[PDB]
């Protein structure tokens, strides 16, 4: 019960002795050095309980209040944890083994809590305060942390922290997880050698970055790719591979390179392939030049729950460009440049599936037309609760991307599969 | 009559003793300290024939008129008292078991009103004056204070102080006012515990918000749920609740923050249920895609009269948020994410019953088909002037939802519940 | 407007407003026109649900030809039909025609409806009795 007493005082003489407004005097190490020193001499003056290990963990305790997160360390350290939700100072549940449990761990105030929140999020460059109380970021290490500030949040600063796992999957992964059919798994690899201008749309959690990662395997090694993102998420094995990333704005609110300079000076680069990490804005519209003037292969995920609300989306974002076309224009830019469009979705049971693999046939109208290669079929749900269902062929034996297929050799292998699929 | 004049010159005289200017100078402890001593010592030196009783009623009453909340201060600490409406310094309403009544309660003055108005608004950090005369916030304890200013309002300073009602109507109270027979209520309940996303429809004050209030009272306790809301009103007992909020743009639009962003923000807190307060806006639509990929049990109320209306207000709101969906599709979202209408409406007498708990089955055609379980039929009118009905279960014995409620071990219970209906 | 029809909807029943037209229909487009102002992307039919739901009663004043001013109607939102709002008058001032010094002479008279749309509201009042001998007395003529 000593230990909180005693972690005040310890806090209390080492401001006296070195104030937080010190920062950036008495750096990492000097810190680590005095502050050591100056809890030892404290140990010795003031009488506690701690022994010679409790004055280094004293020690240690003020290192992370100087350096650390806080009591966020143990958990974020253990792998095991998969989730850390905070939902206010005193109660932080965790994530273990897929079931979500209480944690005996506890801020000391709604203050030390959304100071901590700050320091999470300003890795990247960001901020979240009652100015604007929701961030969303990614960190570098690979995993994803929500906040919500005071004003919204009624209970205290609300911090959600999700560790990706790191090691990704692969095509023969999303078929033994029936997520897609081996004939459309043949098919998407035709789609991926055949250089098809694809779109992966998704919703939150679907599975874009993983898709697209798996597509990306199917790049022949001899082409020259430029991957922009922000996070370097995906991971190629070709050996003619430019990685770049975006570099969010300073403090200051200057210095940025939004992926829409990226993609644009990435037509420059004379690259075969483009591939935009994730389009959010008006990067849209760059990307679909790269798809139309002679970078076929291109490919790009966005946030979408269907092909219809994609190609919405990607109208809304050119529209946000500001560049006054007028909408058939860009419907007219979007039916030349994209050819499939690939639909990640996350299942009412939790489970993730290639629900559609459409294709933009063309314009009619000012209403674009798509035909579906494949269709999640659902039929209802198992004894376990898990939604069943199956990937059915639309019977549609010549793709758009006839042609391209045809030009590397690969028509034979695309028509066995969609026969293949036809046959059940 | 005396008690008016002698308070009068002891404020005089004590302000010349211990000046209310002399902030961080005699503080508050300090403050009320000096302001016995000053009470006593006046006793004496300004004659009053007020006692050792009313000497230390008008030693509190300067200690709060110099600090506290003015006369608010016992309205304030009644529980039975349920708003607190004053319109002026001179005509303080209080509602008091759902009746508004006029109180002997008068303030000074304008100026002291709109003093006591600006204490109370500085607690959350906002100010009220003729710069910025309309202030709305929620104080710490859950209550909320509106403000207006004189320059807006004639009468002077307008204050309403909105207690925040801790007791709540559970389900057996709700059978008890003959709303909803037993029977339906156990098949509420295990429609509740079965994690269905339901949508609780009804019109104005047909109280469709304490409906949704004791519906979240099945919520397995082990479930983390978000609650998103305009005005705090539910209360959740559930140890894993996360409480979320709008707020409003101020005066110059700025810092708005719609109930569509905070649904869109709780998919990425990884939620197992979604609780909107009351679905107006856009956000229906990121609501249903929240119970379609796989955030089952999310409820929300909507302003609807029958489900049949209930469903197209839903879809005139989806396609309110111009995503360019068609009509089929929005159909075939609604179908796949609700699973539950529940139906309360307000009858002619005043009356509130619960008077359809109907399944959205599927599609026939363009239109979406429902069946009833649970039905009010309303036969005639008591000599009394009431309303007379009975409910009664459309004899649908199997319910849609009967393999997930299988699936929970509530099979049984459903079961017993058709039959007591049907045996009835 | 758009608030003030929010406020009729939401519990606050009793509400009062005026605003410049001519007929009670062009009032109702009017209405529609405001709401549009408003910017919140509602299509028309979704504003003519609002306007059937949340209004009850439309009195209609008017200034007449020879400066007289005389409540010419008491309309009632009845309700949608296809996409046009349907309307029923309680009162209406009939001209029959002109006096010996230019005067407009006309005559109030109910066009004999017993059952208003708001019959149920007045009866949770008390007041079904006065509606009913009201309209009664009207109609007796
Ligand atoms: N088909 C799948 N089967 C199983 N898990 C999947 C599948 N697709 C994606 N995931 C999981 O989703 C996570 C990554 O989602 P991701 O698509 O990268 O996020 P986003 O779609 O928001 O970019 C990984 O942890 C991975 O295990
Ligand atoms: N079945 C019922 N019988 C009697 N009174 C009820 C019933 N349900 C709710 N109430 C009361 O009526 C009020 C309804 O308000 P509320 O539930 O907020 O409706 P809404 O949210 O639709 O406006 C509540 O204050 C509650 O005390
Ligand atoms: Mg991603
Ligand atoms: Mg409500």
Redesign the pocket.
Same mark, same amino acid.
């Given at each position: 019960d000593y230990y909180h007493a005693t972690k005040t005082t310890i806090f209390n003489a080492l401001l006296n002795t070195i104030d937080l407004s010190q920062l950036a005097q008495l750096d990492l190490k000097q810190a680590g050095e005095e502050i050591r020193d100056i809890v030892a001499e404290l140990v010795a003056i003031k009488n506690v309980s701690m022994s010679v290990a409790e004055q280094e963990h004293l020690v240690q305790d003020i290192i992370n209040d100087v350096l650390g997160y806080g009591p966020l360390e143990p958990l974020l350290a253990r792998d095991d944890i998969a989730d850390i939700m905070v939902n206010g100072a005193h109660r932080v549940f965790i994530e273990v083994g897929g079931k979500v449990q209480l944690t005996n761990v506890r801020f000391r105030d709604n203050l030390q809590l959304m100071n901590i929140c700050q320091r999470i999020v300003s890795q990247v460059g960001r901020r979240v305060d009652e100015s604007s109380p929701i961030c969303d970021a990614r960190l570098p290490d690979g995993s994803?942390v929500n906040v919500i500030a005071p004003p919204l949040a009624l209970d205290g600063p609300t911090l959600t922290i999700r560790k990706? #796992?790191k090691d #990704? $999957?692969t095509m023969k992964? @999303?078929v033994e997880?029936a +997520? /897609?059919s081996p004939e459309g798994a043949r098919v998407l690899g035709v789609i991926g050698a055949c250089r098809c201008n694809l779109v992966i749309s *998704?919703? %939150? *959690? +679907?599975? #874009? %970055?993983? $898709? @697209?990662?798996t597509m990306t395997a199917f790049i022949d090694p001899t082409e020259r790719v430029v991957t922009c993102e922000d996070a370097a !998420?995906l991971q190629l094995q070709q050996p003619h591979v430019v990685r770049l990333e975006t570099r969010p704005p300073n403090l200051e609110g200057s210095g940025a390179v939004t992926m829409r300079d990226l993609v644009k000076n990435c037509l420059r680069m004379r690259p075969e392939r483009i591939i935009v990490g !994730?389009v959010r804005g008006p990067e849209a519209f760059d990307l679909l030049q790269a798809m139309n003037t002679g970078h076929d292969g291109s490919m790009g %995920?966005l946030?979408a729950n269907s092909p219809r609300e994609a190609i919405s989306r990607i109208e809304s974002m050119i529209t946000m460009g500001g560049y006054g076309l007028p909408s058939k224009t860009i419907k007219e830019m979007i039916v030349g440049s994209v050819d499939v469009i690939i639909q990640?979705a996350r299942l009412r049971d939790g +489970?993730?599936? /290639?629900t559609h693999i459409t294709e933009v046939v063309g314009l009619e109208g000012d209403v674009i037309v798509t035909q579906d290669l494949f269709v999640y079929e659902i039929t209802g749900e198992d004894e376990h609760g898990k939604v069943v269902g199956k990937h059915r062929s639309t019977g549609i034996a010549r793709p758009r991307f006839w042609d391209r297929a045809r030009y590397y050799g690969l028509e034979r292998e695309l028509a066995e599969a969609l026969d293949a699929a036809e046959a059940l």
């Open positions: 994803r990706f #796992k #990704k $999957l992964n @999303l997880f +997520s /897609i *998704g919703g %939150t *959690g +679907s599975g #874009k %970055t993983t $898709l @697209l990662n !998420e !994730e %995920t946030h990640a +489970s993730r599936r /290639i």
